[PDB]
């Protein structure tokens, strides 16, 4: 009863691995030495007592759908991630990820996590979505999804600027305690 198991899901290239490495190593994404292993652990303080926050990293691609739920037993909280500059990752939250974790762990709280929020104010990014006839996902539309899908709450962050990053894991710890 010393360790919180938090499991991270979402489509590839939304920045979830990069999110976990920067919070776990206290480094900017460009400055961490790549690792060949999966998963991350960081000490976190509860009332002055030391706890381990275990971060389980999953692959979002279809080839991994059969073995991924084997990591769900004993989870204390789920982070369901999408990038706010990728409406496909946003739609797959409603249409893939929330159902999959609901089905295997219906009583386990989950947070909706928006990533890469710095790219919402990027010209090349906002224009590259213009040529594709798509627009970036605003925070207000993402909080509405969070309430619809019974999420504990919505949190945004950017691994690059670190804005909102700490609050994501503060929110995750508090949900993991029930």
């Amino acid at each position: 009863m010393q360790t919180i198991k938090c499991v991270v899901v979402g489509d590839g290239a939304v920045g979830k691995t990069c999110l976990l490495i920067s919070y776990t190593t206290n480094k900017f994404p460009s400055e961490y030495v790549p690792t060949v292993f999966d998963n991350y652990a960081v000490t976190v303080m509860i009332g002055g007592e030391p706890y381990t926050l275990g971060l389980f990293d999953t692959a979002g691609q279809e080839d991994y759908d059969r073995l991924r739920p084997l990591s769900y037993p004993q989870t204390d909280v789920f982070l369901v991630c999408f990038s706010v500059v990728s409406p496909s990752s946003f739609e797959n939250v409603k249409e893939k990820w929330v159902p999959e974790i609901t089905h295997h762990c219906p009583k386990t709280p989950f947070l909706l996590v928006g990533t890469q929020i710095d790219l919402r104010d990027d010209p090349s990014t906002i224009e590259k979505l213009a040529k594709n006839k798509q627009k970036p996902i605003t925070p207000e539309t993402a909080e509405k999804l969070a309430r619809d899908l019974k999420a504990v709450k919505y949190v945004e962050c950017s691994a690059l600027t670190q804005k909102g990053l700490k609050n994501v894991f503060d929110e995750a710890i508090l949900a993991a305690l029930e």
Binding site: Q2, T3, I4, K5, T17, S22, Y23, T25, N26, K27, F28, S30, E31, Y32, V33, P34, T35, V36, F37, D38, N39, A41, T43, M45, G48, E49, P50, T52, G54, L55, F56, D57, T58, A59, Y64, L67, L70, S71, P73, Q74, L160, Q162, K163, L165, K166
Partner: protein, 416 residues
């Protein structure tokens, strides 16, 4: 360099530090005051008697008080304030050496009740240490290299490197945004940027029309020769001036690349004074650095993983979730490259001809220990899982066996 000019400054910092919660820095301010008073009384003949050396057991930084250009009762009052803040800062191990000279004072006065008090307070200082030492309960701080660049903007801070000692568990997110707001106001929020690159900044690369703050997480550094001391959480933060961080670089010129092109640089920053100090930031005065080639990187992280696995398997109360985290992240990597990318890049017969034999032989030996340590971790997990992780365990074993088979092909050796 004027006695009361320095003394009011130290007392001012003490009060600032107390409000800001920098309680070690407050304790240091008072011990520097007591050291100054002792040196002044010694120079102005008064007859502890050695002057500032009296408190070297507390910190060697007080040598600077003997750069000088007040009675016994007030020297002792400074020492009481010092003990108060050692208590509040959890540096309990120093309380004995501050009270010893007070005790000598009161021995002479035959004040037995006071002596009983002083020995009593050294007593719970050591009781507290017995209760909390090496229990990860004391948060002495996190350390950040901070460098300021922009000669049109920064005053004294221009072009110089600091180690900032931050409270408790302050993460990179918090000290970045804090320093950004601070210097966004005195210079303008449109002209201040955070440098994330942990390489030594070259000013010519920077737009002189901007002001830059480089922020990098660092950790106290010790080599195996110093691990003779530095056995406790306190000692790992007691009188330290070296700090390490790593930076990734490829053979090409990028930060990130493949397993066969990934190097890293190891930089060690030295500070002008020792932490804890009368200030919570100390300037860096020099740098030493070394580099590791791709097979050295691989050797390094494989050793660590073997030690992580073995440590968990020899705990008194094995932490099941923490064991699975590392075990699954060793034997069934699915997001990163997996440790087998090391075996393929450096241990296969064709590839191994491109690297020094000793280094190929060291990485082979580590992988054997890796096999055993994954095996021992699979056995420990089996004695701990319940019915809901039986399929989970069976796939871990299946992933482990598939890994030993490939490892056996690559090394041409039977790995059990």
């Amino acid at each position: 360099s004027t006695p009361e000019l320095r003394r009011t400054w130290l007392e001012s910092m003490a009060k600032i530090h107390a409000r800001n919660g920098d309680l070690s820095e407050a304790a240091m301010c008072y011990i520097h005051i007591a050291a100054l008073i002792a040196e002044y009384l010694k120079r102005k003949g008064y007859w502890f008697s050695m002057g500032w050396p009296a408190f070297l057991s507390i910190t060697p930084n007080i040598k600077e008080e003997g750069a000088m250009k007040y009675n016994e009762n007030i020297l002792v009052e400074q020492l009481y304030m010092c003990v108060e803040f050692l208590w509040k800062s959890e540096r309990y191990e120093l309380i004995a050496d501050v009270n010893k000279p007070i005790i000598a004072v009161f021995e002479k006065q035959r004040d037995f009740k006071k002596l009983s008090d002083l020995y009593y307070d050294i007593h719970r200082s050591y009781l507290k240490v017995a209760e909390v030492v090496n229990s990860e309960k004391r948060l002495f701080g996190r350390y950040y290299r901070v460098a300021f660049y922009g000669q049109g903007f920064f005053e004294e801070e221009e072009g110089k490197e600091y180690i900032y000692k931050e409270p408790k568990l302050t993460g990179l997110s918090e000290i970045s945004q804090r320093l950004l707001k601070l210097y966004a106001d005195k210079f303008g929020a449109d002209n201040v940027k955070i440098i994330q690159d942990s390489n030594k900044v070259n000013p010519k690369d920077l737009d002189p029309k901007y002001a830059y703050i480089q922020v990098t997480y660092v950790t106290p550094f010790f080599e195996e020769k110093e691990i003779e001391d530095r056995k406790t959480d306190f000692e790992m933060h007691h009188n330290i001036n070296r700090f390490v961080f790593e930076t990734p670089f490829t053979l090409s010129g990028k930060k990130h690349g493949g397993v066969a092109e990934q190097c890293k640089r190891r930089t060690i920053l030295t500070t002008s004074h020792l932490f804890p100090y009368v200030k919570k930031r100390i300037q860096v005065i020099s740098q030493s650095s070394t580099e590791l080639n791709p097979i050295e990187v691989a050797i390094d992280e494989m050793s660590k993983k073997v030690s992580e696995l073995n440590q968990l398997c020899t705990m008194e109360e094995v932490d099941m979730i923490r064991l699975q985290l590392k075990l699954q992240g060793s034997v069934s990597v699915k997001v990163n490259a997996g440790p087998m990318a090391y075996a393929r890049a450096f241990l296969e017969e064709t590839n191994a001809k491109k690297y020094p034999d000793n280094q190929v032989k060291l990485l082979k030996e580590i992988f054997r220990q890796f096999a055993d340590a994954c095996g021992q971790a699979l056995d420990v997990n089996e004695r701990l899982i319940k019915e809901d992780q039986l399929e989970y365990q069976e796939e871990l074993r299946s992933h482990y066996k598939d890994m030993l088979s490939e490892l056996s092909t690559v090394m041409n050796e039977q790995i059990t």
